[PDB]
Amino acid sequence: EVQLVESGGGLVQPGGSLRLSCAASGFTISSSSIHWVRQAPGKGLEWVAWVLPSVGFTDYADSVKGRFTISADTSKNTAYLQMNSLRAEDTAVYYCARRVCYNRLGVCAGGMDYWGQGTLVTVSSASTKGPSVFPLAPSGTAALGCLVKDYFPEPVTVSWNSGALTSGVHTFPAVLQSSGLYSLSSVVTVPSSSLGTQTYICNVNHKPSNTKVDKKVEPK
Amino acid sequence: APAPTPCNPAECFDPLVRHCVACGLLR
Amino acid sequence: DIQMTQSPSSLSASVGDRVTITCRASQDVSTAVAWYQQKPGKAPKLLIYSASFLYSGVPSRFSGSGSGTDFTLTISSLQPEDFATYYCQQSQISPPTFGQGTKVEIKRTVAAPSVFIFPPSDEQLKSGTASVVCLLNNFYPREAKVQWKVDNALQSGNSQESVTEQDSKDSTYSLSSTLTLSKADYEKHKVYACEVTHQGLSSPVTKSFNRGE
């Protein structure tokens, strides 16, 4: 099957540079155009570039032209996006994609069918800080949860009882605090009878600061 | 004006890229 | 360059409704328009390519039409899992510009939130700050008002809200409101309460606690 595996995301200084990779399986990239698309927080999808690797032809959105360089290495079956002179407005999730073509009367009928998993680029001078995890103590049905406060950059993941608890879980979007640090809560509703018997643990992970916390939430 | 290069079997012409590329079966 | 204009910007439609999203090109783009569906924070999904052609695997209820300048994505019978932002893209002429998108939300019956208040943990208080957290769970519509009262006194701009995407089976929302104070100001007062106003609620619902159980 087809797979596009991205890598190289992260945090960088305004003015700084960074290289995304998009490694492909199940097809040859030389005969297809590989595309980069990105989504800034609370904005539409924005196409940024393409490369036709067989010959090395490229094209760029005006918004990125003169700063980013798209390229490919046919023998490594991988495409790249070198991004320079980065700005706050470049902060986004960057996806790579393949344009599939089908033969309709000699010309391509196509679109972007296979996509990488998307990799977050944050452009900012702030330092990476790991979160603190605080319990939201409970008390029919009871709400409890845990509060993941003061981290940078995005993202955090939250799972419950090591993958056993999923129903009734709500992990909220992160909010940018006035302090410049993110925070979020994950909550769950459980049967009110279990509170004294089942232990509830939130598994928080913040890969950017390699912080991994597992927090018990018990009645006070 | 200049007629594009003819695509071999297995390829077809993608106007987006102004070039021949792989082209599968349309269904 | 070529510009793609979608309509409407957004819409709300009931499960079972026919949904029509329009997409216009500034210039003739033949039939080279595609339609994509994007679930929040996830890779978009190719629904339709070349105006009318269905990508293998895509449910039959999605279809597209048009050529030249005017294109339309139709969802014959809207299902709960279909909320997303839908984008058209033209690939006749480079650069292949996206339309603004069209956010589809699922309209459904009104439902009240179960409200819950949470006091700040002992752990946090040591750090010098206190977060008080109000939860509104599984409600519809999205419009809701949350007010904080510390010893019956209305609070200004010391709280923030986050909301979940629609639930993919029951189309409800959940909402967190977080009230942030210094430890000192927290330890000066007794009674913390969030007042929730919402259409599903006949009158406001207030959940409260006194500091130190």
Side-chain angles (χ1 to χ4, degrees), chain A residues 1-219, chain B, chain C:
Chain A
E1 73 192 70
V2 178
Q3 262 254 111
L4 294 172
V5 183
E6 307 185 47
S7 45
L11 170 71
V12 266
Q13 305 282 132
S17 301
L18 210 38
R19 195 169 84 147
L20 312 189
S21 298
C22 174
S25 297
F27 77 109
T28 175
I29 66 160
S30 34
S31 64
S32 297
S33 71
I34 307 303
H35 295 252
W36 289 94
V37 181
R38 71 177 178 180
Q39 185 160 40
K43 277 194 199 302
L45 286 186
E46 203 201 349
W47 174 88
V48 324
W50 62 249
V51 56
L52 199 213
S54 52
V55 291
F57 287 12
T58 69
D59 192 39
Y60 297 96
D62 295 357
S63 69
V64 137
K65 201 183 289 183
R67 288 182 312 121
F68 293 12
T69 301
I70 201 190
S71 59
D73 175 336
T74 56
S75 57
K76 294 189 149 191
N77 205 45
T78 301
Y80 304 102
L81 188 64
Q82 183 61 246
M83 299 175 289
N84 307 121
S85 310
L86 286 163
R87 309 159 176 158
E89 79 203 43
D90 302 314
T91 287
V93 177
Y94 289 73
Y95 301 93
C96 71
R98 137 185 134 159
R99 177 166 164 87
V100 75
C101 278
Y102 300 111
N103 197 305
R104 178 179 158 177
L105 300 164
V107 316
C108 173
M112 293 182 288
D113 66 331
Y114 286 97
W115 297 70
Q117 6 83 64
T119 194
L120 211 218
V121 191
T122 311
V123 177
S124 154
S125 64
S127 337
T128 116
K129 192 191 188 288
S132 306
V133 186
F134 303 121
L136 304 176
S139 180
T141 306
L144 62 90
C146 85
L147 161 72
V148 186
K149 196 178 174 289
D150 297 330
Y151 65 89
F152 194 77
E154 292 258 66
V156 142
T157 60
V158 181
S159 92
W160 283 94
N161 293 357
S162 308
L165 224 187
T166 42
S167 305
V169 167
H170 288 297
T171 306
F172 290 94
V175 196
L176 196 267
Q177 290 164 121
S178 75
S179 70
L181 308 165
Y182 290 98
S183 149
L184 66 77
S185 289
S186 175
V187 305
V188 56
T189 44
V190 297
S192 195
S193 52
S194 67
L195 293 176
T197 22
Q198 175 81 56
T199 75
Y200 294 110
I201 298 164
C202 53
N203 318 108
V204 176
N205 191 191
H206 182 241
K207 215 221 81 180
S209 65
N210 211 37
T211 322
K212 215 265 168 75
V213 172
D214 296 290
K215 179 57 65 173
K216 272 78 103 80
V217 182
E218 279 164 357
Chain B
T5 295
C7 306
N8 69 18
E11 291 199 326
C12 81
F13 180 88
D14 184 10
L16 183 63
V17 174
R18 289 191 85 214
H19 203 281
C20 292
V21 301
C23 290
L25 179 59
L26 182 77
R27 286 178 120 312
Chain C
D1 294 336
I2 173 157
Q3 177 183 342
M4 303 295 295
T5 319
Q6 288 183 230
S7 309
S9 166
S10 66
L11 66 98
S12 194
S14 304
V15 166
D17 282 359
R18 159 173 291 147
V19 176
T20 312
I21 294 162
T22 277
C23 163
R24 183 181 52 174
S26 55
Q27 309 176 359
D28 177 27
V29 290
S30 251
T31 59
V33 169
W35 289 95
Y36 296 88
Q37 172 191 62
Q38 185 183 40
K39 251 79 210 319
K42 291 218 168 212
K45 199 152 285 150
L46 180 52
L47 299 181
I48 286 154
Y49 66 87
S50 199
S52 64
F53 285 85
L54 194 68
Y55 184 71
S56 86
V58 173
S60 48
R61 73 177 174 275
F62 298 98
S63 69
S65 54
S67 66
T69 276
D70 294 316
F71 302 87
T72 72
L73 166 68
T74 296
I75 311 173
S76 61
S77 189
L78 196 72
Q79 303 301 294
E81 63 270 24
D82 294 334
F83 79 85
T85 306
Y86 291 87
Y87 292 97
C88 67
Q89 185 196 41
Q90 73 76 28
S91 56
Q92 186 54 36
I93 286 161
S94 233
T97 47
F98 283 106
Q100 41 145 134
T102 296
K103 179 162 166 155
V104 173
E105 189 218 82
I106 302 298
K107 178 156 93 284
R108 64 96 93 197
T109 233
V110 177
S114 333
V115 187
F116 296 92
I117 192 163
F118 294 105
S121 66
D122 284 315
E123 254 178 296
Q124 188 179 19
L125 270 19
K126 294 188 171 191
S127 329
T129 327
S131 302
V132 184
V133 179
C134 189
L135 167 63
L136 292 58
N137 216 34
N138 311 332
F139 66 87
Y140 190 88
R142 192 201 174 102
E143 292 91 84
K145 186 190 179 200
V146 191
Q147 286 189 91
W148 287 99
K149 290 158 184 186
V150 180
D151 283 337
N152 254 162
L154 295 132
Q155 298 299 308
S156 282
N158 50 359
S159 66
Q160 298 188 249
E161 286 175 355
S162 182
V163 202
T164 47
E165 75 196 21
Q166 258 181 320
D167 175 84
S168 56
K169 47 212 181 315
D170 73 17
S171 311
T172 58
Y173 293 99
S174 289
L175 184 150
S176 77
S177 191
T178 306
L179 175 73
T180 163
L181 302 161
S182 77
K183 188 195 198 204
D185 293 332
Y186 174 69
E187 236 129 74
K188 287 210 156 200
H189 301 97
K190 201 187 227 268
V191 194
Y192 301 79
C194 49
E195 184 192 70
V196 179
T197 286
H198 182 74
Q199 177 179 179
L201 290 175
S202 81
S203 73
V205 154
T206 297
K207 289 286 174 174
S208 66
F209 75 88
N210 299 150
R211 190 186 90 267
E213 70 174 350

